[PDB]
Amino acid sequence: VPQELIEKIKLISPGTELRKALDDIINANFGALIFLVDDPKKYEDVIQGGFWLDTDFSAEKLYELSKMDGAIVLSEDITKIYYANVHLVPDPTIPTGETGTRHRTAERLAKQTGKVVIAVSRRRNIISLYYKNYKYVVNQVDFLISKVTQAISTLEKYKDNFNKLLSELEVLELENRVTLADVVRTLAKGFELLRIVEEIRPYIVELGEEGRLARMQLRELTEDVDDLLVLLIMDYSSEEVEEETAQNILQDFITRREPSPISISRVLGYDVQQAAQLDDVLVSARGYRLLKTVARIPLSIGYNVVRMFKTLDQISKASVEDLKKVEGIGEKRARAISESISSLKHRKT
Amino acid sequence: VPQELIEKIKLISPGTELRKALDDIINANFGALIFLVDDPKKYEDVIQGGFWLDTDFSAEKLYELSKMDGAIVLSEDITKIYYANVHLVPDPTIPTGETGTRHRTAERLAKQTGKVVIAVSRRRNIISLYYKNYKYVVNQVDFLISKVTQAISTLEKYKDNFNKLLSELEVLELENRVTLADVVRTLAKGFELLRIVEEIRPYIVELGEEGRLARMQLRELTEDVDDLLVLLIMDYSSEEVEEETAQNILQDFITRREPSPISISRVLGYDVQQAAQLDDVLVSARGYRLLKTVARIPLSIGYNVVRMFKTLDQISKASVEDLKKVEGIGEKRARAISESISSLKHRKT
Amino acid sequence: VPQELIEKIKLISPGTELRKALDDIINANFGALIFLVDDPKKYEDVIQGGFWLDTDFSAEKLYELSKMDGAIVLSEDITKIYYANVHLVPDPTIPTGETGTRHRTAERLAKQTGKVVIAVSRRRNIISLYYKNYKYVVNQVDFLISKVTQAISTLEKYKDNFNKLLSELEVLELENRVTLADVVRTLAKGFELLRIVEEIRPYIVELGEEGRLARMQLRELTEDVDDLLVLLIMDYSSEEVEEETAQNILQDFITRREPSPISISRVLGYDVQQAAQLDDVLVSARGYRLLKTVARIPLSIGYNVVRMFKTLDQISKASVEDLKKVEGIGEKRARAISESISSLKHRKT
Amino acid sequence: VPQELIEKIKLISPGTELRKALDDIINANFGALIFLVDDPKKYEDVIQGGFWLDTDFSAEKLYELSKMDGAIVLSEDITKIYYANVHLVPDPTIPTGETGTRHRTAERLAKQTGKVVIAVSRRRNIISLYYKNYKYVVNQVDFLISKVTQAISTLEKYKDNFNKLLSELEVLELENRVTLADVVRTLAKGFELLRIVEEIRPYIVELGEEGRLARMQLRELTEDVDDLLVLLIMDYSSEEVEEETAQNILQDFITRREPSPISISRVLGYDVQQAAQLDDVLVSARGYRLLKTVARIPLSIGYNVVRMFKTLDQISKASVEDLKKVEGIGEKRARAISESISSLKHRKT
Numbered sequence A, B, C, D: 001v002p003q004e005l006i007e008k009i010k011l012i013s014p015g016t017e018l019r020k021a022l023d024d025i026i027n028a029n030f031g032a033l034i035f036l037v038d039d040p041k042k043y044e045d046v047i048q049g050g051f052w053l054d055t056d057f058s059a060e061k062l063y064e065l066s067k068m069d070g071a072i073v074l075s076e077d078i079t080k081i082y083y084a085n086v087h088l089v090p091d092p093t094i095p096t097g098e099t100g101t102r103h104r105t106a107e108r109l110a111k112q113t114g115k116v117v118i119a120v121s122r123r124r125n126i127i128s129l130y131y132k133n134y135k136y137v138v139n140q141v142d143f144l145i146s147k148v149t150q151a152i153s154t155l156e157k158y159k160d161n162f163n164k165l166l167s168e169l170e171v172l173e174l175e176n177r178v179t180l181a182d183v184v185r186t187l188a189k190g191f192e193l194l195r196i197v198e199e200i201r202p203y204i205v206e207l208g209e210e211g212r213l214a215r216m217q218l219r220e221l222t223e224d225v226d227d228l229l230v231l232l233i234m235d236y237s238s239e240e241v242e243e244e245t246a247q248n249i250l251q252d253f254i255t256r257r258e259p260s261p262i263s264i265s266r267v268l269g270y271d272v273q274q275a276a277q278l279d280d281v282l283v284s285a286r287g288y289r290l291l292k293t294v295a296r297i298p299l300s301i302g303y304n305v306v307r308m309f310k311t312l313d314q315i316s317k318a319s320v321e322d323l324k325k326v327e328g329i330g331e332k333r334a335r336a337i338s339e340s341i342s343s344l345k346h347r348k349t
């Protein structure tokens, strides 16, 4: 979705005085046909008749003005009301797939002037915004909150299965009994989870000020899933992988690549064709996840610890002194790794 | 519900251009009486007057056309609009239990031609689809999402009690202190849970594209309950039972047989009449559930392990070598069974 | 609420053909004034004019008939439609606090005949049912599901705090470190929880067939709270108390007595005035809760075990043989008590 | 928000007969312009024409009276209806930013008389209450329950992350491995959580009797978060802090100060500028949280225990006798501290 159009959809997002007026116009079954321009003079050929107002804009003035036939002309920044009750006359030969004279006039005029045109018909209750060759239908807040509420509810469900997989994987990690199947199942779920988010983002945006609580909900639910997934890929990929690299694999399984078990294991560096094979491939965490999250060791110094010990299993067998031989590890970060790792083995297994 | 009718209900499911038009017609309080046929000529006797259109179909064309009196005739695949404003004249002697001339004409005509007929009255806001001797009332999306949201909410509650029973049964399983009552209580709940799903499936289907999130929610909630229940029946039935057999018992307690404590224990091979008896019948898991789910041993090779050890208790007392004597168990699947079982005993008890 | 009136509210509960018609009448803004009697002849003095129908009842017939002025007369069992468009003439001197001629006529006539009278005004959308000196306003399904959904949601919250208290009390019970404060806090919460249920029951009832899922939700949420609370009172009351007695204390703290910390401890047999005192009163479970729920020992035989050991602490120190000396305890119920108790001490503490 | 205005908003809160009438007026699209005064005589100059009623007030009388043009005059306590159909004539020169003659008359008249004036336009469906120079727009119940339901839902999410942080911090506390970062992260979340509450309080208030369940939900969710947060600040602040002091820091991070990681640690007495520094600052709980909550030791006597041992670590190493040397600690409070602390170390780590 063009960012050029996003800045336009903002103009009529919940919270703006312009949207407040549109809502009143819809609820009042009045019609609306708004033309947004910066210099009316430059477009005096597509604007006929009506009344020249040139007054400050307000929701109430726009609402009252929409009680009349025709179009209203506003300054692009929505701070002025230039015309009212005018006859918009764009080129009739410009292509349009819209219905009704108001909408066909809207799209045509937007294309022609490269400006924004808003249309609201008395019959239906949708807000249609035309920019250039773009068309965006703005849904009512209640429809959006309905979809959003459902999505969030779906995410809770996914986040739950994710936590269960992750806590079970944790046990397998400490006991060094992890299989590729286990890792993939966890990654798969986390990928799916983040796709849901990406797919509802636009909905959140159309909510504007009414999207406040939904953003807060999403943030609590996906708080650290991304870092956790990147750390998982760094700990189980076939061969050493930099964080930046891992972040791309994540991004890639959220936009394009489908989180398929076989597909995920493949991109991780494991050559498999049969899904059943995964349960046979034994793997061992490198140790990044446990070093940054629990041991609170910066990923940068973690690279050194991994370099010298290779896996979490060897790191958990290391001693405070051994660890101290690592570049970036003093006495504090040494006991941190040690105690934190031993603590988890005693409590989770 | 006939599958022949399901393919028809799809024609007007949320997501289709045809339903989009019907919704606009309802919201606009216009009436509608649609006749779907492939060859108009063949039915020129039930079609009188109106205008011959023979144009491509579109939601907007149908919406506008419904502003006129009479019926609209469309091609069965909803890609053409043949007539508009016609007078449908089915045989008045065909039985009908409907009200109002529009609906009685609808059902009669559907019966007569064996074709689909849709009726929407200006007064009410329901979509009535007539096929042959079938009649399906399509509810609005908001009514469906309301029922569905409640059901899902009810399932969460059931899934919770299910997890609690299952985790407690787990403890009893490892400690080999399981009683028939325990197993039945768990099976009962899982059966109830899956019935809820089956009973709301039709609702999900009427939602069409608006059922996307509801399907995803249901899938996370019932992710593996079915396999888990089949494995429970295989581990506690009175005498050895094949998976296929277990799958039928499950299916049977989801469609016909009521998940009654006494009824479930009975079908499991235990002869009981008094509910209080269950707490007295001591039972021991065969070990399938723990072998496939935790040990990730294919059910097929599991049959061999069960054959040689009979119960989970004996399997947990077996050694890596002992297990290796089983057909299908090498060194990996041997340690898998061993370590996984011992791991659970140490963590859960 | 009189049970005599409950049987009347059923007549217009969601699911009945009569309510289906009323809903259509409300949605269509038609008015309604229904008089339910068994023998029209006996009331020919309060019924003037109109048309004598004496036909089978149906929602459609009632809906159509309500398009006319006046009242409709139906048989008490709603299987016949006697009159339509009649003028109901009850005694004008009968007291009534209602507004508008339709409602004042309704209440007056119900009082006079001791029969049921239903009124629906075109203006508002409520269903008013008059019986004798009773008046019941039936709310729409959407309003009910809204309140119910909130209550259920509130219960989840309470059930959560209840589980947390109960699981913590469990730890204190096994470790024999329970204080009166702990018990009261748990009882208090469970009492509150069940009050919520009692207070929303009427709402559930007004929902009729639309209350199906709400009943199922409530049942999962309050599944065994009552037995659990009775067992708590039996295990911590100041002196030995029979189950029946405990069940009355529960019932009493759900209807009359407010679940006050000081009030609860008082009724339990402990003489306290200051809330802060509770944290000082040391108490020890008798053992009923653990014997019936976990050990699955019938409350009747439990009385014997408690008799001989007094507290759970002594029971957990008892041996299989010791327990066998109890009337009703063989070898199975002996190991049951033993293993189950020791199992919990090892897992929870 | 002035408390003087709060007492006014109550007059039209859900549950009051006055609001019941307003709702009926809105649903009936009638207009309303109410003037509340105690002595009509004193204002006979702003009141012209209409009918002098001087009758008892009732929702039905007000509803019927609003069917006429003009304003209605009521006694300030809403127990009398003085005028109806009058012409309110406030000073036209009083400033007003309202639209339409009804609203401009409302605000002007409220300012002039310092009395309350209510306005409801036929077009829209909002209730505008004017007091002095204050203006309060009362939203419908459905809009409020929607926002509230979302907020509560958002809180659940926060309360969850809070519990997870707190339970993890618990482990670190017992193991005496707590870092400033850990404490701040937990405090931050709890602060955020309580802000949500404060920010939705006004919504709850506008709900009146329809806010009952929402208040109960909030109470279960935030049951003891405040005490828990105060105890956290007392246990980890840089230097000894009195409860009253801690309560102010809490209050301050809920109203003004933003719960910023760096900002929180700073106010706790730790001099830091870089967020990354927190993970390096080792800290140790004083022991208040564990003494009051678990050991149930009054905060007052806790001060003594902390005085003599300084930290929870030393308290957990203390013996029953050692503790007995503390002012306020006998044998019971001595074993309480001991057993409770050792119990937690054995179960959580």
Ligand SMILES: Nc1ncnc2c1ncn2[C@@H]1O[C@@H]2COP(=O)(O)O[C@H]3[C@@H](O)[C@H](n4cnc5c(N)ncnc54)O[C@@H]3COP(=O)(O)O[C@H]2[C@H]1O
Binding pocket: A031, A033, A068, A069, A070, A071, A086, A087, A088, A089, A100, A101, A102, A105
């Ligand atoms: N060139 C044409 N070809 C066919 N029919 C024509 C027509 N011009 C006008 N009409 C018919 O007149 C109806 C109402 O015209 P109206 O100006 O009141 O009411 C109009 C007008 O206030 C506004 N509008 C449409 N186009 C406009 C334009 N180019 N400039 C300013 N306002 C416009 O939208 C309203 C409704 O449009 P809608 O099509 O639903 O309804 C149209 C249409 O059925």
Ligand SMILES: Nc1ncnc2c1ncn2[C@@H]1O[C@@H]2COP(=O)(O)O[C@H]3[C@@H](O)[C@H](n4cnc5c(N)ncnc54)O[C@@H]3COP(=O)(O)O[C@H]2[C@H]1O
Binding pocket: B031, B033, B068, B069, B070, B071, B086, B087, B088, B089, B100, B101, B102, B105
């Ligand atoms: N044979 C008959 N017996 C008794 N009354 C008769 C009748 N024929 C017509 N009417 C009366 O005229 C009303 C409206 O006729 P209309 O054609 O405008 O408006 C009709 C028409 O546009 C459509 N419709 C009904 N039957 C149809 C058919 N066989 N073919 C095409 N359109 C039909 O549905 C609309 C409403 O039907 P509705 O019954 O509610 O309303 C009917 C009914 O009260």
Ligand SMILES: Nc1ncnc2c1ncn2[C@@H]1O[C@@H]2COP(=O)(O)O[C@H]3[C@@H](O)[C@H](n4cnc5c(N)ncnc54)O[C@@H]3COP(=O)(O)O[C@H]2[C@H]1O
Binding pocket: C031, C033, C068, C069, C070, C071, C086, C087, C088, C089, C100, C101, C102, C105
């Ligand atoms: N004795 C009286 N005193 C003062 N005003 C009188 C009156 N009798 C009739 N009216 C006026 O006429 C209005 C409509 O009469 P209507 O018979 O059409 O329409 C009536 C009628 O169909 C029905 N209804 C009321 N009382 C009834 C009765 N005793 N028997 C049968 N139907 C009744 O309810 C409808 C609306 O009643 P609503 O009061 O809202 O509206 C009443 C009222 O304002």
Ligand SMILES: Nc1ncnc2c1ncn2[C@@H]1O[C@@H]2COP(=O)(O)O[C@H]3[C@@H](O)[C@H](n4cnc5c(N)ncnc54)O[C@@H]3COP(=O)(O)O[C@H]2[C@H]1O
Binding pocket: D031, D033, D068, D069, D070, D071, D086, D087, D088, D089, D100, D101, D102, D105
């Ligand atoms: N001084 C003035 N300047 C410009 N226009 C004037 C005017 N006085 C009256 N009107 C026009 O007449 C409309 C309706 O007057 P109305 O008395 O029926 O119906 C009125 C009246 O019943 C009530 N209302 C307004 N001001 C009032 C006042 N000072 N005292 C009592 N009632 C008032 O609110 C209704 C609607 O007001 P609304 O402005 O929407 O609608 C107004 C407005 O467009």
